[PDB]
Amino acid sequence: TWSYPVDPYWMVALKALLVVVGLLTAFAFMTLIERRLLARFQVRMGPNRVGPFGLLQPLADAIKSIFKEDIVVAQADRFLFVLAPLISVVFALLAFGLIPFGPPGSFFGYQPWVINLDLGILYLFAVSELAVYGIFLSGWASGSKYSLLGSLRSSASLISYELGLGLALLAPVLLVGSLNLNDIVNWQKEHGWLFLYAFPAFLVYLIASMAEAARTPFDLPEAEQELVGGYHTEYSSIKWALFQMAEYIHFITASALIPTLFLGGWTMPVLEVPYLWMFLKIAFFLFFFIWIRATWFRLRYDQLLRFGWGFLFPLALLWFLVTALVVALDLPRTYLLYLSALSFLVLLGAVLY
Amino acid sequence: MTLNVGPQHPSTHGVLRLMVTLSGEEVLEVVPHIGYLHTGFEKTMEHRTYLQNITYTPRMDYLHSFAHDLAYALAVEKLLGAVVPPRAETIRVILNELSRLASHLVFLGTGLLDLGALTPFFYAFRERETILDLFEWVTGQRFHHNYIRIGGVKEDLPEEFVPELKKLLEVLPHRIDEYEALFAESPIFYERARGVGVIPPEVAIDLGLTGGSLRASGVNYDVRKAYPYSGYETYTFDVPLGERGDVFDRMLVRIREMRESVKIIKQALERLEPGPVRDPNPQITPPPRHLLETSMEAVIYHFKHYTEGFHPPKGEVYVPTESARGELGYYIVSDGGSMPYRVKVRAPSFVNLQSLPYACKGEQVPDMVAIIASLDPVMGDVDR
Amino acid sequence: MVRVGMRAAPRVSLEALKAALGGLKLSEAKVYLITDWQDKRDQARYALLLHTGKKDLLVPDAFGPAFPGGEEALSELVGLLLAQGARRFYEAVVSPGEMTALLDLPPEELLKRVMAIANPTDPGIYL
Amino acid sequence: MRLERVLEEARAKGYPIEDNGLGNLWVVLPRERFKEEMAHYKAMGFNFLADIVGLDYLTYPDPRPERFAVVYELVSLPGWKDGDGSRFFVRVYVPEEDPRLPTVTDLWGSANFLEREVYDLFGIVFEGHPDLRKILTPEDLEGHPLRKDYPLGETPTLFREGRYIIPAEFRAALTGKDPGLTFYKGGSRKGYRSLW
Amino acid sequence: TLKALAQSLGITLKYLFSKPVTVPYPDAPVALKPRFHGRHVLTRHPNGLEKCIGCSLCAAACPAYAIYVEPAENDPENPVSAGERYAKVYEINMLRCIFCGLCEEACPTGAIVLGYDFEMADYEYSDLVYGKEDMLVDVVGTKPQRREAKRTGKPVKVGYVVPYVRPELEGFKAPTEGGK
Amino acid sequence: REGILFTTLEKLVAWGRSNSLWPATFGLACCAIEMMASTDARNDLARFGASPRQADVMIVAGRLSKKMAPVMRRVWEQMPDPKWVISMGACASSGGMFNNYAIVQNVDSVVPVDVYVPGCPPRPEALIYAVMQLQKKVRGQAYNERGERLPPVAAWKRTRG
């Protein structure tokens, strides 16, 4: 925050609240869109009933949800069962704040973000650990071990790739030289589109985000069809809704973060209207990810650990040292345009034999 | 950890209960527990006319029902010495194979979902819907169709069945390939299914695993070939096979079986010319409905047939048939009564299951789900 | 097998049953409610056969809303089975014509018929 | 060819041979020789054990040697090492007051569940079994359902005003030992067979 | 075999952009085949005389024993059926019923013939034991359907259409094809 | 608070639930496969949970074996409270064509039935009719043949215990 202003604490608050409830309506309507987009992929139709577009069905659903009877299991730790859903949502919502959707002053006088800070990615990392805390904790809190085991599979896997995200994030930091999202973005304004320079790390970041419930590992798990996922399976009315809510906000936070960092989110080469583009990129990754949600198999997490731990993460720190070598010896930043382009040429061509 | 995978939950399919003796992420031994669907046909059917039973036959294996229909019809016809007309036989091969395509479509739909992901249940469902529409067209029912008769079949095929069977016979080759397209080149599935699910032929034989999950481990035994019945003896017929029995190979074998089934459909469809449809022996077959207004003998026989039914000779009988789940057949003891003395049904799905504590022994846990779907059970057949 | 009670007389039968059960713990017993007509519980009558496993007990059709003050009697019956720790309740459906003949059969036969026809049931419907 | 070697063996040892002209064939071994003879049967090259089918002949119009009778189905798979396609039934009668019979579990693991079923539904206990647990009938079910002395257990089907049907009192169909509704039954209703 | 992930996606894409498949019942009426096994109907002759001579052979044919027929003697002055005998009671327990149509098939007068209706889901067991006067050819609707249509006064529309009705159902009016 | 006591509020929540009616399927026989067809065409329903915890509507689809009854019992009990039971097909509703030692001759014995759906199997669209029933049933828009209006939730009517 060398170059960027601060709105008064009341306005920071108000913006925070707007972003939270905005994220509420966001998650619900996103559930509708994925329902139907999936329906198109599998050549059926969505829910038009309880319409008009079918888009009043989160009202109906939320309405079921509350008035549903929130059940607290005995044989569940009384304090932890309640507290668990609380944690998972709190640490999910926060840190979508940081993401700038526009230049300063452009919020109608103020600030497209909520908070910016000076240490950016670390905040994200920090908040990311704590949701997982919520996961394995709920697994305990429920005090059904069937729930536990799954929560443990979950946590082990998540934590694995969660490590992956860091060594992913190292490379682009070298180039920009800042821990701030606005600076990274602006770096992409001038030198342009970090994934041009950073590509392998782009790959390992994205796929690292597969672990965080994104689908294609999925021995996350959802309880479905396996040794269950754990955390949900013991909760009913509001609390269950809270867990689902958190996992989805994380999904869109990631769909925002991917353009924000490696691409130029907002801050596109041309047109450069402030909000619309970040929402569009969000939409792009969101849709592509939904395709991923539908159209690919599971890992078992035996493999998922193999894939992230054995493949993604070593690959991640390998590229870091390369970009470290390049930035340390100051050569040009061109060598990374060339290198990333070339590595992309490799990591693609070996698919089509 | 003796983990208790429940009766109906969590997505252990078709109401089975499993005591997975399991410490860690492997599987020590699963101690299977069945009997949750036990309806008790073998007793109930001792209390129904041989005609009446034909309503109870489709109802066990409800996916490939007509294999039940066929097996039972045959064993009785044999036992009372009835002569089934050629066009009826042809229709019975068509329906049997169409019902097979239905069943198989279901098996791989559920399999792909069970571990792995959601999408392809739907396309298989689309083709299955075209098949079910075929069945509705001819029998007036989706399944449990009361059609086959000890003589032959209930009535003839309507004008509209032929055109529609072709439509599906046209899309299916392209279609079956599309399912195959996704699978044979298995992206994750290969690293998911190739290793899992060990089937030695010798133990398959030792534990008696007959049902097309047998040929996936390299034993060549098909009832339509080994012990021919309904004129499968006369068809251009390919039997798909597997290399070493895993999940993957079982899974593809049945897909090949679908195009070969379709080839039997086309082939039988070619050989079909007009005629009558069931054995006219009045002892066996209720009179023509039109002359109930004219003949004494007609009315007497109508009344009698639909009340008492008929009495087959004192004797025991059995005939083997091929379902999409393996060897199926009815062991019929008749006492010369209007109702069978006893009907024991050889349940393929029941013997096939002695090899699951074997099959999923040492396998993964996420895989322990997949390894179940890959064995293709139907519980109506099992419990029974 | 013992037979207590008499047909169509709810309060005497309830008082006698209360007398006969005693301090017997019912955790391994099976409770069979014998009635005619699946759908209509409003005009229903109920007889009961109790298989304790160490000995059996028959009560004729004296229970249910069919007779005056009968509903409260069936309700307290089930409540009382529940208190001693009986859990497994079953519902058996007979023809009205059967009901008289059924309880005049010898113990063993009546009991096998009852176990053959009886349907697992929620104790709550009789409360 | 392996079947001929069975029949030729049974004739010399005085084992009776049942045949219906439908193409089904039986061989009845005594209780004694059963275990060993059948051990010899797997040893004889019999790959596959298809069935164990329990039979309760209590209500069968003609008498048989003993009340319960079990039939095993032995085969040699045609697509295996050298498979004939030889399949056949071996019947073993069992006393009412002695429901014993050796398992072939050692021989075929097929014998495992099937023999258990025949234990559940009929009272027949199979020797040497790894586990004879009740299989099918509800845990707390008492007795053995498919044996004839055990009620099919019907409930009346129900209609509107006091109207019921008792199926067993409704039945038009007759069993083998049923008289029929006239003075007697002759002909087709004492059993019929068409002649091809 | 890396290529597959890609092609897998591709086909699904093709299918997304292909829009069509499905029917939205009850808003779009389901198409049924002409032989389908639906709600039992009793049929009449041209005279209007009922085909049912009340012989309860439908009931004897019944594997679920779901048909009760109390029989009766025709009144010379004002007749019901064509014999001397007709059906005083015809009840069918839809809940007992398995839907074979062995009843129709047993029926000597072509009286009992399964129909086309499926919207019969109802709240109460005993509302589900249909009587004769719910099944005659003149009747249009199922029980809850008709009951809703009276408590609303909004006429019945069945959620089905057929190419035509069978010869055996003769007299049974239905929404067909574009015949209408 | 169970969806009750403001004319605006209860109606509002009651639509919420009826249109939200969240089937938790309990497959048994062939009827379950006939409901897997229903999964295709569906549009207030067919998201699951699947886990019982998360759902109002229990769909009993198939023959319920006597040995199977105490299980379904707890699954029903182990559901949140505002919950409904649909009974699918002849075997479930009455004893069906199997009238015998093996099978429950009405599922209403063990779980409170809201709606019944005849057929063997019933066509899927009949089950839509039943969930529209139950839709419109919990709206308190439902009547029997005797003239009586039907309660939104049956199993608000049994004594638990």
Ligand code: SF4
């Ligand atoms: S369709 Fe079958 S079960 Fe239904 S009444 Fe007719 S004969 Fe009986």
Ligand code: SF4
């Ligand atoms: S419907 Fe037909 S079979 Fe039934 S009583 Fe009437 S005339 Fe006879």
Ligand code: SF4
């Ligand atoms: S009602 Fe029919 S379709 Fe449903 S479970 Fe029973 S036999 Fe199967």
